[PDB]
Design a protein around this ligand. Sequence first.
Ligand SMILES: Nc1ncnc2c1ncn2[C@@H]1O[C@H](COP(=O)(O)OP(=O)(O)O)[C@@H](O)[C@H]1O
Ligand SMILES: Nc1ncnc2c1ncn2[C@@H]1O[C@H](COP(=O)(O)OP(=O)(O)O)[C@@H](O)[C@H]1O
Ligand SMILES: Nc1ncnc2c1ncn2[C@@H]1O[C@H](COP(=O)(O)OP(=O)(O)O)[C@@H](O)[C@H]1O
Ligand SMILES: Nc1ncnc2c1ncn2[C@@H]1O[C@H](COP(=O)(O)OP(=O)(O)O)[C@@H](O)[C@H]1O
Ligand SMILES: Nc1ncnc2c1ncn2[C@@H]1O[C@H](COP(=O)(O)OP(=O)(O)O)[C@@H](O)[C@H]1O
Ligand SMILES: Nc1ncnc2c1ncn2[C@@H]1O[C@H](COP(=O)(O)OP(=O)(O)O)[C@@H](O)[C@H]1O
Ligand SMILES: O=P(O)(O)OC[C@H]1O[C@@H](O)[C@H](O)[C@@H]1O
Ligand SMILES: O=P(O)(O)OC[C@H]1O[C@@H](O)[C@H](O)[C@@H]1O
Ligand SMILES: O=P(O)(O)OC[C@H]1O[C@@H](O)[C@H](O)[C@@H]1O
Ligand SMILES: O=P(O)(O)OC[C@H]1O[C@@H](O)[C@H](O)[C@@H]1O
Ligand SMILES: O=P(O)(O)OC[C@H]1O[C@@H](O)[C@H](O)[C@@H]1O
Ligand SMILES: O=P(O)(O)OC[C@H]1O[C@@H](O)[C@H](O)[C@@H]1O
Ligand SMILES: [Mg+2]
Ligand SMILES: [Mg+2]
Lengths: 300, 300, 300, 300, 300, 300
Amino acid sequence: PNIVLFSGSSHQDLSQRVADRLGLELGKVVTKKFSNQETSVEIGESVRGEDVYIIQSGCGEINDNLMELLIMINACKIASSSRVTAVIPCFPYARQDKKDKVGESRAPISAKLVANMLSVAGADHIITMDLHASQIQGFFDIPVDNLYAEPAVLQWIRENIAEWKNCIIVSPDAGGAKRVTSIADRLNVEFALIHKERMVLVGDVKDRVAILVDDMADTCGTICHAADKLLSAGATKVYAILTHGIFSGPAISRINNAAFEAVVVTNTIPQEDKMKHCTKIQVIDISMILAEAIRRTHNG
Amino acid sequence: PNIVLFSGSSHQDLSQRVADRLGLELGKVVTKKFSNQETSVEIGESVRGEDVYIIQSGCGEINDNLMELLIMINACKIASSSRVTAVIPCFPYARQDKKDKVGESRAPISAKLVANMLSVAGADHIITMDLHASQIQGFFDIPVDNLYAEPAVLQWIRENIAEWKNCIIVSPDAGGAKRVTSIADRLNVEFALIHKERMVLVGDVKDRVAILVDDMADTCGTICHAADKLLSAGATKVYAILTHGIFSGPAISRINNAAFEAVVVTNTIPQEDKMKHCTKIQVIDISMILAEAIRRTHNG
Amino acid sequence: PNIVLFSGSSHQDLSQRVADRLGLELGKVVTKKFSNQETSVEIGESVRGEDVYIIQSGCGEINDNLMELLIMINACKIASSSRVTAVIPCFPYARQDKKDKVGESRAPISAKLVANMLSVAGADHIITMDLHASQIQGFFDIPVDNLYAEPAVLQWIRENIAEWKNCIIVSPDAGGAKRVTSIADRLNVEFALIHKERMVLVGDVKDRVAILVDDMADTCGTICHAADKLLSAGATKVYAILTHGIFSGPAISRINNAAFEAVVVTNTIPQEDKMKHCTKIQVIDISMILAEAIRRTHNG
Amino acid sequence: PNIVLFSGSSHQDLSQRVADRLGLELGKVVTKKFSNQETSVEIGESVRGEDVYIIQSGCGEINDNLMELLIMINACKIASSSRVTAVIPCFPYARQDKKDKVGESRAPISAKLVANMLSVAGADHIITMDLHASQIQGFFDIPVDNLYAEPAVLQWIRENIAEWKNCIIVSPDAGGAKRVTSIADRLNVEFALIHKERMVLVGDVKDRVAILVDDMADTCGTICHAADKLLSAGATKVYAILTHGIFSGPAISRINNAAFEAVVVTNTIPQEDKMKHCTKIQVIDISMILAEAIRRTHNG
Amino acid sequence: PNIVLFSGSSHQDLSQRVADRLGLELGKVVTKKFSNQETSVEIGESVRGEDVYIIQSGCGEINDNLMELLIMINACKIASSSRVTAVIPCFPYARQDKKDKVGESRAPISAKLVANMLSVAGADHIITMDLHASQIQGFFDIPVDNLYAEPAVLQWIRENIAEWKNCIIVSPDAGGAKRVTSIADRLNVEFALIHKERMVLVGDVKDRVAILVDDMADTCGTICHAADKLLSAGATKVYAILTHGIFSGPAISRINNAAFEAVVVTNTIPQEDKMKHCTKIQVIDISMILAEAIRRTHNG
Amino acid sequence: PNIVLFSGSSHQDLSQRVADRLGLELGKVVTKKFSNQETSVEIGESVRGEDVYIIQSGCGEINDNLMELLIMINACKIASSSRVTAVIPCFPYARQDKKDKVGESRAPISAKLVANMLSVAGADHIITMDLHASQIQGFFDIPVDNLYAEPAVLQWIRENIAEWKNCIIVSPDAGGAKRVTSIADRLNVEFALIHKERMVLVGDVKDRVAILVDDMADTCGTICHAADKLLSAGATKVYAILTHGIFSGPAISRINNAAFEAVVVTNTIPQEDKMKHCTKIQVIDISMILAEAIRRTHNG
Ligand SMILES: Nc1ncnc2c1ncn2[C@@H]1O[C@H](COP(=O)(O)OP(=O)(O)O)[C@@H](O)[C@H]1O
Ligand SMILES: Nc1ncnc2c1ncn2[C@@H]1O[C@H](COP(=O)(O)OP(=O)(O)O)[C@@H](O)[C@H]1O
Ligand SMILES: Nc1ncnc2c1ncn2[C@@H]1O[C@H](COP(=O)(O)OP(=O)(O)O)[C@@H](O)[C@H]1O
Ligand SMILES: Nc1ncnc2c1ncn2[C@@H]1O[C@H](COP(=O)(O)OP(=O)(O)O)[C@@H](O)[C@H]1O
Ligand SMILES: Nc1ncnc2c1ncn2[C@@H]1O[C@H](COP(=O)(O)OP(=O)(O)O)[C@@H](O)[C@H]1O
Ligand SMILES: Nc1ncnc2c1ncn2[C@@H]1O[C@H](COP(=O)(O)OP(=O)(O)O)[C@@H](O)[C@H]1O
Ligand SMILES: O=P(O)(O)OC[C@H]1O[C@@H](O)[C@H](O)[C@@H]1O
Ligand SMILES: O=P(O)(O)OC[C@H]1O[C@@H](O)[C@H](O)[C@@H]1O
Ligand SMILES: O=P(O)(O)OC[C@H]1O[C@@H](O)[C@H](O)[C@@H]1O
Ligand SMILES: O=P(O)(O)OC[C@H]1O[C@@H](O)[C@H](O)[C@@H]1O
Ligand SMILES: O=P(O)(O)OC[C@H]1O[C@@H](O)[C@H](O)[C@@H]1O
Ligand SMILES: O=P(O)(O)OC[C@H]1O[C@@H](O)[C@H](O)[C@@H]1O
Ligand SMILES: [Mg+2]
Ligand SMILES: [Mg+2]
């Protein structure tokens, strides 16, 4: 009746880390694809009456991983499991959370679609790390846990950056005001703001060190322009701390010929191959937070 | 089979205005209360096969108006109406859209509860003006229209404030960066930022005019502090433009003994009685936007 | 995993009585109101895995208490509670259980609306005392316990009224034939009947003591006229025993200038303030019945 | 897109009458049984886009007719029908509307089960004549039309009984007080009451004509004893008017050796064979009421 | 909290056998019929918190047994049982699993209707023996266990037929190729095929013994024709092994005047009365399979 | 209010054919992918009140196309469309329609998962061509049309194969008995059967022409072995007619080095690139059948 932990095809390293921190090991599931690109999920062990926990990040090929997660949840549910919990470090389609505004002709809400699919597959609980919009919690009818990576970010700032008592935290866009502001309050220091459309700046950032904080980085269209503007303004050096490092498209190329002292990300998305092609990127372990959340859910 | 428009106990003036702009008149419904404070809804005319439209703002006593709206929707649905649309100028419980963060011990999500109540009552469409969080659109499975009052705000700024070409727009909090930023871009001028915890300010605001823009004002705990900070900083005069003016609690007392040149709001919440006790308050009609949205929904 | 009992803003005394009879104490919940008349519910203790019981009577301001109950149930459900049970001593909107007849134009069914609201909020069980219509049990898909206060009424009749062996039991209306008939059968005594539209009487009621039995009294529009008719017919004195004493509107004034020897009610609705302004009113404790029902549900 | 009327195996005569009053004819459906007592439903004509009406009374073998109705509704729904309406003159399992009281060990609520069956089969509207409990309207989430046969009963009383101005109306049980009372009020005449457990009577019934009114008669366990008590009390003759005459079990034998001047019923249940073995039974047509209800639903 | 086993009106013998194999006895339930052919279900013992198991075969009068099963499940669910499991040895309406093809005018899918009825009644698990179509598992959203009687068929073939090493297995129709083929592979011997429309045969079946295997036999319209064709072809003797022996309509008459050496069936449908009028029929116990499935579901 | 036809990324040619046969043209939708492999759906025109028809085959990368279809349906539904119909020429995950048998450990039912996802996305109708299992019709609660390509197969056999009056139709497996048998009856000729586990044959196929008929061919693991066995048995030439030609994995390599003079398939899956690398493959247009089905659904 105790925890049975399962892992998907994507991001095996974090799954192994979370299993180790729980003093367990991943269950026997073979997730391959048939000849015509159809997902094949075969659970080897018994899940009857167990508290199944599935960890599947929204990275790599998003649709294939999402389909694998749904099929795994359905298979566990039909196999008479007590309660199936889906742990999603990076929620897929989390940037499509609104019907947008004037101009976006009949755009859908893909986040609610994913929520409905997870609910109809048979999920009983959702664990997510640093959702793009905290209001996505309301997209479900089951409990949702929105974990935060801010304590790790503060710890990294304190330990690594020696001048953290006289720095500033800068938001690369207008919507990152809340996160940047909360971090600045936590470190007991001031902050600035940057907006595009071009680049505008409101803050001191003169002969001091600035840290760019954002939730994610897909193509680094942001953060890079913010670093350029900050360097033009008078900043001595610029750091970049991120929660979900996608680094898709050009990305790595842009960081490589950039003046970032360090680009900091977390385990939520595999960074192994990305770190090889870029020395700036550094990784922060968050497996402890997910493991503690899993324990809190399980014991009760 | 054409539009049948109904009005609630709250905000009769806006309902009459919307009816006039539609070249119609409100249906015959008597909404009183029984002896033991229970809602009594009696629809006098036939709604069979009609496109029923109900306008009920979340103002005054929130719970009583919400229950009246739900009972009216249920009565219209059981009476074999073709499609029932709920027009809510101010969405109740819109500030409770998250499970908050560390410290808020097991707080609920009241916005999703209201969404579920409206869905189970029998609503087929929702029309809302300037939702507190745009992601509340995903709280429903029926279509939701999130109207914007920004064009009226811009028009008022242009017509009334003569120095609008050399002003700035200031957000009283960190979460208002997006709205203020969009308004600044539309007016082709710059912007500033104010954060509490005390007040901190990043911007020029020296010997010029600043306009405070926020989504709503419950007790004017904000906006007033921002005006004080701006006046201390060097602003010649401070304006305040708002979408939903609750003006609850002390409110009117605070604006009265304040240095606001004008506090601008919209129809969405009845401002009749409030305007009598405060000369600063001015109202912007938004009935045309709701009427146009209703026409767009109906015609198809 | 044992019982966690919660109480609402209305009827604190009955909640404390039920808690005492269960050898427990009410959980730590702070239920206040925000500035704009919106309910604030904050659960202080952990409800994860607990079998939560919420007691919220439909008295006072009905809509406000109902919204309080719904928000509390939703908060308990989202907080990973094992099972949430709503104990409602007086079911709100219980008199609106039909679509009425010819004349009531498009009247709704508010009882089914409340049932759907409780079902969608997350309630797993319902405990009610003396429902207005027993068929309201079918308004839910979850189990519903319809308790009966008849044993307490019989005990009061036996102990207090010394001539209970040669009395009669009179129904103030046509719909109360079943309750009056069952009480008369259980007491092994005869009965009468009264119908309005004016007053008509079929029974003996000549130089004997008559007892009026009804389910509830909102304004005492009934019962008072029944006592007048009984006194006109020849009854020496008239008693009145009720389950749910609303005593709204004039009520207390009518009883005060009436010839009731005693007006007997039960705990279900707070009678503290009402009893002060009227000496005739007497209260029968029903906390033991609710406590026993709660124990029966919990143990299993 | 106009009315397409269908008929079940039970009660072909009433279906043909309703079709004639609508100036239409029943659709081509062959409803036979396979070898192993399984219902076979084959719709011969096209129902795509039509507003189908199905008439299936709960008479004869109840389960077989109910399954026929459900299969027919499902077949019409899957065949892309616009809206399917189930016209049930006598609602099956209408006497099982409560979980009863102390003594009935874990009895079910079959009426809600039938309601759920009809809702899940695909019914969009329900038309019923004189439901046993009017609160069964709340057992559905679709609109329910509860027709009344009282005008026909009153017309029969006026036309046939010549002394209707100086009669009385008697309820054979305690639960029939409302119907008897309303009929007495509408006829501007007084009333009496009878309760079992044995027979007790409260009323005049001395050298006058008494009429027994009930909703239904299954075995005539009631009504017969009421007539015996009335004859003992002094009634010159006793009439009996009923809405749904089941006349199951002994029934016909009991009426045959009884002193009823006439036993009046309505069409809702086939009375052809029953009337042959008993001269007292007379039938009142109700096809016009159902036809008018169907027209009212269809036109809109 | 352990197993509470209930039995329906049909097939008492199999229920008693399954109870004996589980070392238990059937619960106290009285399932009779009211006067007007309505099902009466009264559960005598407590099912609160128990794992209720109901065995009800789709035999005899199908509709009455199905309604009894649904009412029993609903009664057990409303009585606060932990989990209700429906054990259906023969799934009713299992041959209506498709909307057929060109010619069948708007036929329904009765199997999905039965599935929806069982789901809405409150069933949490389904156990079925040898479904007509294995895809009926997808007709439910709850887990469904499709047991197989093939091991018993193979054992009977080995024990009774001494020449089973040099026989063939023949399918009476085209749709039985899979079952016959699997049996042939398991017995390490060859197979043949027979198709109607008349009879056509592809196989050796010359001066040897053939066994006809099908899923069921309603009227023995098949199997008898296959035996005639096989005997004409050169088969020395013909056997017939079946899972669900309905033997409805003529049936027994056809087997009696046939050249079958033995017609083998299983318990799933009561064969007691049928076996008396036909010496060829033999029965294979399958109570152990159902008992083992029940134990597997319960233990977990 | 008339037909608005939309097309997905996969199978543009068939969509254009169906649009041409309907005398219309495909709507303006841009279906691309964001940087991080997330589907981007933007509808350019208005679908309010329209009867949207979306054609999306389950070919190529299955998961991406399925996600595109779901997002398109959701976008059309939220945009206030009258009715959204999904036309799926090849149903994805149609081979996973059972929970298999002993040996497949806790395998899921992916077809029911896809059905649930389509139902929850907002689909109102499903049109599919030659489903793998006809019972998948019961996997939905909305109407499902299972079109058949058999008339085209018969026409091709008649026109192209000149010796079709003295041929045989052979099933490459045991489960294809029904299709092969129906085709043989339609052409008024005989048939044979082939089963693996190795290869076994029952039929004449001696100096005559044989045609292999199956529903689909993924890797041609079947059909090729059947052709080898048929050639070894004595067949002069062997043909192969298929409905859904996947031709994944090796496929083309197997057909090219085989003795097939014709491998006949239909449009449902794009055959353009496949036909270039193999001269044997030939294509049959089925756009007329889909267009006629669409018309039949639309007009009604
Ligand atoms: N995976 C993705 N990659 C790139 N753009 C995306 C992706 N998903 C959504 N988008 C687009 O990005 C926009 C969201 O931008 P964002 O900065 O979050 O808006 P906001 O200013 O409201 O925060 C949406 O309009 C959506 O069309
Ligand atoms: N009607 C109300 N009046 C006052 N406070 C409210 C009301 N509804 C919710 N709140 C509280 O106010 C907070 C919302 O503050 P807000 O500034 O919108 O948060 P955020 O910083 O996420 O924007 C919530 O935590 C909630 O507890
Ligand atoms: N809280 C209330 N106060 C006063 N009247 C009410 C209340 N709720 C419902 N009603 C009205 O009272 C009527 C029910 O009266 P009642 O005597 O119970 O009906 P019945 O005659 O069927 O018993 C309904 O028609 C409804 O309109
Ligand atoms: N078809 C039927 N035939 C006989 N008795 C029934 C039938 N259906 C239900 N019953 C029983 O009759 C009782 C209902 O009797 P009724 O007099 O209507 O109750 P009440 O006294 O509440 O009016 C129920 O307890 C039920 O067990
Ligand atoms: N209880 C029944 N008795 C006789 N025939 C039935 C019964 N239920 C369904 N049928 C009919 O029998 C047909 C099923 O025949 P079957 O041989 O199973 O079809 P298939 O060729 O698809 O296997 C269905 O078309 C249905 O109309
Ligand atoms: N896309 C696919 N490619 C290859 N194999 C599959 C695919 N989808 C399902 N399967 C497997 O193929 C099996 C179905 O084989 P099939 O011949 O249809 O079985 P049956 O003999 O019941 O018809 C399933 O057990 C499933 O595990
Ligand atoms: O793709 P790039 O520009 O790196 O980042 C996309 C941005 O879009 C927003 O949702 C996030 O805040 C993120 O910063
Ligand atoms: O109550 P006061 O301080 O006036 O305003 C409450 C604030 O809380 C936020 O949700 C809104 O942005 C609003 O400005
Ligand atoms: O409001 P008053 O006249 O006191 O009482 C209302 C009556 O209406 C009925 O539902 C109850 O039986 C109650 O007696
Ligand atoms: O079965 P019999 O005694 O004829 O009648 C049953 C009675 O039970 C009540 O629900 C009805 O009012 C009906 O009169
Ligand atoms: O009624 P008879 O011909 O005996 O059998 C009916 C047949 O129809 C099919 O579903 C079964 O395979 C069964 O063999
Ligand atoms: O992948 P190959 O062997 O070509 O074909 C797979 C087979 O599996 C069955 O569902 C179909 O009948 C098909 O013939
Ligand atoms: Mg009353
Ligand atoms: Mg009665």
